[PDB]
């Protein structure tokens, strides 16, 4: 919440004074060509002006979507990396190099183009991309075109990544049965992994959706409370509005939102992070340590 | 546009007459349905025992009251008719009168149907209850009388709407 620069459905004083200042506009409207000119970026959190502005929804939605994509990429990378550590700890066979390496490389490379494009747009400020033209660049499977491409090597980089992804598909299916035959079940991993990677990548957007929903509900509650406090500033009306706001915060903000967030977080952790580890089975060893008596 | 113009150009006298007739028709249908519903239970009770014929007849009378009210409303609507002059066949007053007549007729018919169905169900239950025990007949009759007020309310609403007729 401190990072989000939102406190109890209300902004506050950031570590800086004001990130964005209305370009001129001593009397002009906010919606203008000059719009708002930013002196410097607020380091503690998001710009305070952005939260209450009309343009709050698009910028916040784009930022949340990018953050969700990056977090999902990081979690998938960590889960895939844990496979090599698990194989070494259990001293697993050559199947790690046979299957874990292509499995951790194919999805990583496939999401790498999108992650790098997001970073470059954030880094280079390639406004000719925004949230949409990034997907547009990712949309085209064919070669050529690339007019909107921002990466200097994107024309060849996209083709190289596509070739690597295409070649990685058999490399994740053949070597384990080959080693099994040489040393003399892959159907479970077959087909399932390809669709599951896309499913896990998509599921990361659940966090962004939940964050947006929580922000919207908090904004609605704060707006209701402010409307009660401003026009109905009468003592009885103000007290009733405060009680209603407290009840709403207890119900939706406190209970429902937290429960939904916890359930979604657990679902994400099991679906993707646990998908590349754990592997199930086993049992909990327990001695007769007076457990019933304890 | 052209279809909309044709729809707006329909004769209001036809709609008013249709509503006037439909009010009486729906009232008669609802009264008949309620009468049949009450009569089935009354005949069953009489087969069980002919002692409660006088008590049972109240339900039939209440059901027929709906038909009587519908007939009165139909007579009022017929009185509300006019000569329908050719010059004012599409005048705003004529259209308003026709729309009001149609609305009043539809309201009266629907209210009469609902009241008749409710009265028939109540009487069908009440006859069986009286056959079970004659002591409960008073409460059942009171409930039926209270439920019969739907037709009276609908008739009142229709009569109030009937004052809107202003056909030249």
């Amino acid at each position: 919440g401190l990072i989000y620069n939102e406190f109890f459905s209300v902004p506050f004083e950031i570590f800086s004074h004001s990130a964005y200042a209305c370009r001129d506009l001593s009397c002009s409207e906010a919606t203008t060509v000059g719009l708002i000119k930013v002196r410097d970026t607020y380091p503690f959190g998001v710009d305070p002006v952005w939260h209450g502005s009309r343009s709050e929804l698009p910028f916040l939605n784009s930022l949340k979507m990018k953050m969700s994509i990056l977090l999902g990429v990081a979690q998938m990378n960590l889960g895939i990396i844990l496979s090599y550590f698990n194989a070494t700890f259990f001293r697993i066979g050559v199947n790690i190099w046979c299957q874990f390496i292509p499995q951790i490389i194919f999805l990583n490379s496939l999401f790498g183009y999108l992650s790098l494009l997001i970073i470059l747009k954030w880094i280079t400020g390639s406004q000719a991309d925004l949230y949409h033209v990034m997907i547009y660049m990712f949309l085209s499977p064919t070669d050529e075109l690339g007019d909107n491409q921002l990466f200097p090597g994107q024309k060849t980089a996209q083709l190289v990544l596509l070739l690597l992804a295409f070649v990685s598909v058999p490399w994740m299916l053949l070597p384990k049965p080959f080693i099994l035959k040489m040393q003399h079940h892959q159907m479970i991993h077959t087909i399932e992994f390809v669709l599951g990677a896309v499913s896990n990548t998509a599921s990361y957007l659940r966090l962004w959706a939940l964050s947006l929903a929580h922000s919207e509900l908090s904004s609605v509650f704060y707006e209701k409370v402010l409307l009660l406090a401003w026009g109905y500033n009468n003592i009885l009306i103000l007290i009733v509005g405060i009680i209603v706001f407290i009840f709403a915060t207890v119900g939706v903000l406190l209970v429902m939102e937290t429960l939904s967030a916890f359930l979604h977080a657990l679902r994400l952790h099991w679906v993707e992070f646990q998908n590349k580890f754990y592997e199930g089975d086993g049992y909990k060893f327990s001695p007769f340590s007076f457990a019933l008596l304890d | 546009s052209s279809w909309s113009r044709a729809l707006v150009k329909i004769s209001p006298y036809t709609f008013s007459a249709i509503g006037i007739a439909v009010a009486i028709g729906v009232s008669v249908l609802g009264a008949a349905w309620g009468i049949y519903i009450t009569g089935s239970s009354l005949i069953g009770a009489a087969i069980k025992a002919p002692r409660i014929t006088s008590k049972n007849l109240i339900s039939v009378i209440f059901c027929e009251a709906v038909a009587i009210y519908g007939v009165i409303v139909a007579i009022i609507l017929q009185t509300k008719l006019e000569s329908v002059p050719a010059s004012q066949i599409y005048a705003p007053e004529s259209l308003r009168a026709g729309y009001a007549i149609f609305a009043s007729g539809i309201i009266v018919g629907f209210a009469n149907l609902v009241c008749g169905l409710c009265v028939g169900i109540i009487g069908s239950s009440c006859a069986l209850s009286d056959a079970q025990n004659s002591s409960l007949f008073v409460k059942i009759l009171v409930i039926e009388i209270f439920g019969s007020a739907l037709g009276l309310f609908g008739v009142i609403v229709g009569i109030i709407m009937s004052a809107q007729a202003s056909w030249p």
Binding site: - | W33, S41, G44, I47, L128, A131
Partner: protein
């Protein structure tokens, strides 16, 4: 809702009045009730199923022979109607709901219907078929009562099997294969070999919980009496008989229970 007034209202009122009036003497009362039921002749299918209920037992009794001529003495029209030994069984396979299924299920005739125990097994199979047929005619609140009755019969058969009929090949598999929540969760009674085990199995259904109680009475009897006696005790629920619903089966059951009580009275 309006269909009741559209048709069947007079018959429903007559049945309600007859039931409200209800409360060799036992034989005379049974004959009077049977005459009242017959004189009453959609609801036709319900009446046919209700009659077939006892007609299954009547046909099972008539299937003997072996002093078969004595079946005419108990020719009560309520259950022993003439319209409802494989050669004669094929002829009797008509005009009954459970008969066509029993023709294949009991194709062994007396071999699968031995008078010691297998005749009871054939009767239970016929009762299960009749209960399934009655439950097929869904659309009213009587489905719950029919399910309760079938569950009581199945549970009583299972209890009898576990008590002493286990030695008569009525094993856990036979608790549902031959012994007629029960249509979905009857597997819990396959291991209830003890009265305490029976109570534990009954604990799976909180409504069925505490119904067994000490199990000194009701469950003490074999065949279909163990959980059927629970239904007899709980028949006060059937005494509700909310209006504008099929209550012909309820009235028939109440008349049968009254006849049974009168018979149990006998010489005080």
């Amino acid at each position: 809702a309006m269909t009741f007034n559209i048709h069947g209202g007079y018959l429903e009122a007559i049945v309600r009045g007859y039931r409200a009036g209800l409360l060799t003497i036992v034989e005379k009362c049974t004959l009077k009730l049977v005459d009242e039921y017959k004189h009453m002749l959609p609801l036709s299918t319900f009446l046919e199923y209700i009659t077939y209920g006892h007609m299954i037992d009547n046909v099972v009794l008539i299937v003997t022979g072996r002093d078969v001529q004595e079946l005419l003495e108990k020719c009560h029209p309520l259950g022993m109607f003439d319209s409802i030994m494989r050669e004669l069984y094929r002829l009797v396979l008509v005009d009954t709901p459970l008969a066509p299924y029993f023709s294949e299920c009991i194709t062994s005739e007396d071999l699968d219907d031995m008078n010691i125990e297998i005749m009871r097994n054939t009767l239970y199979k016929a009762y299960l078929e009749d209960f399934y047929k009655f439950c097929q005619k869904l659309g009213g609140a009587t489905a719950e009562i029919m399910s309760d009755l079938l569950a009581f019969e199945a549970d009583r058969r299972a209890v009898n099997i576990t008590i002493n009929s286990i030695g008569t090949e009525l094993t856990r598999d036979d608790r549902r294969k031959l012994y007629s929540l029960y249509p979905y969760g009857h597997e819990e009674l396959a291991v209830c070999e003890d009265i305490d085990q029976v109570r534990g199995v009954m604990e799976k259904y909180p409504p069925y919980q505490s119904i067994f109680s000490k199990l000194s009475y009701g469950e003490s009897q074999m065949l279909d009496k163990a959980f059927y006696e629970e239904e007899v005790k709980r028949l006060c629920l059937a005494f509700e008989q909310q209006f504008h619903y099929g209550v012909f089966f309820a009235y028939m059951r109440l008349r049968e229970q009254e006849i049974r009580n009168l018979m149990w009275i006998s010489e005080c």
